[PDB]
């Protein structure tokens, strides 16, 4: 990413900021609408069957807090956040075993919500630099799955 581009990401990010719990929850809320198998990741999770409960779970809040806690500490590294990964490759590859397919549903939801939310600050400048700056992530995290012996 260019530097203009890494800040169209943290300027809307600092949005994101504003209310990380309102954020996150929007974001695994369309996360586990548009890919409901996702949902089969989380313990004391499948059981919640509409968006009313989904919004009063203090489990899923919680949960979207510490996503978006570690994502937006990775995006101010502007791409050299290779030990901020290390600890999320270890437990993402071999104790909650999520393929890099699901980090693309969740990057489509980071994105989604963005451009719901935040328009003016989310045009086709910063939704390409958001794209990229996801992509990089995922990118990264799949070579360390793969030095830690996961395919996923
Ligand atoms: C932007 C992508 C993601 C980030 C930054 C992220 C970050 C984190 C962090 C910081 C933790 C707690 C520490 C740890 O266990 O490593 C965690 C836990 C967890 N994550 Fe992720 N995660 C991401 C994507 C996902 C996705 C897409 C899923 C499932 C579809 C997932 C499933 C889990 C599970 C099952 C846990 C265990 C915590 C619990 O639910 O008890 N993660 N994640
Ligand atoms: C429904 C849901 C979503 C995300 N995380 C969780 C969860 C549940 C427990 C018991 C511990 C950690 N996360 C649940
Ligand atoms: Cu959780």
């Known amino acids: ?16 900021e504003a209310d990380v719990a309102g954020h996150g929850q929007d974001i695994l ?6 890919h409901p198998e996702t949902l089969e990741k989380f313990d004391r999770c499948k059981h ?4 009313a409960e989904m919004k009063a779970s203090e ?5 979207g807090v510490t996503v978006l806690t570690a994502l937006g500490a990775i995006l101010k590294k502007k791409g050299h956040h290779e030990a901020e990964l290390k600890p999320l490759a270890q437990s993402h590859a071999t104790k909650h ?6 980090l693309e549903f969740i990057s489509e939801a980071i ?10 600050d989310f045009g086709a400048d910063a939704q390409g630099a958001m794209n ?7 990118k990264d995290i799949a070579a360390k799955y ?3 012996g996961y395919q996923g």
Not at 97 to 102: F, N
Not at 111 to 120: A, E, K, T
């Open 59 to 63: 489990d899923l809040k919680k949960h």
């Open 146 to 148: 793969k030095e830690l």
């Open 97 to 102: 075993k999520i393929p890099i397919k699901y």
């Open 48 to 51: 919640l069957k509409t968006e």
């Open 111 to 120: 994105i989604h919500v963005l451009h719901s939310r935040h328009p003016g």
């Open 29 to 34: 809320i369309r996360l586990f609408k548009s």
């Open 1 to 16: 990413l260019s530097e203009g581009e890494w800040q169209l990401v943290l300027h809307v990010w600092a949005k994101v």
């Open 132 to 138: 990229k700056a996801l992509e990089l992530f995922r």
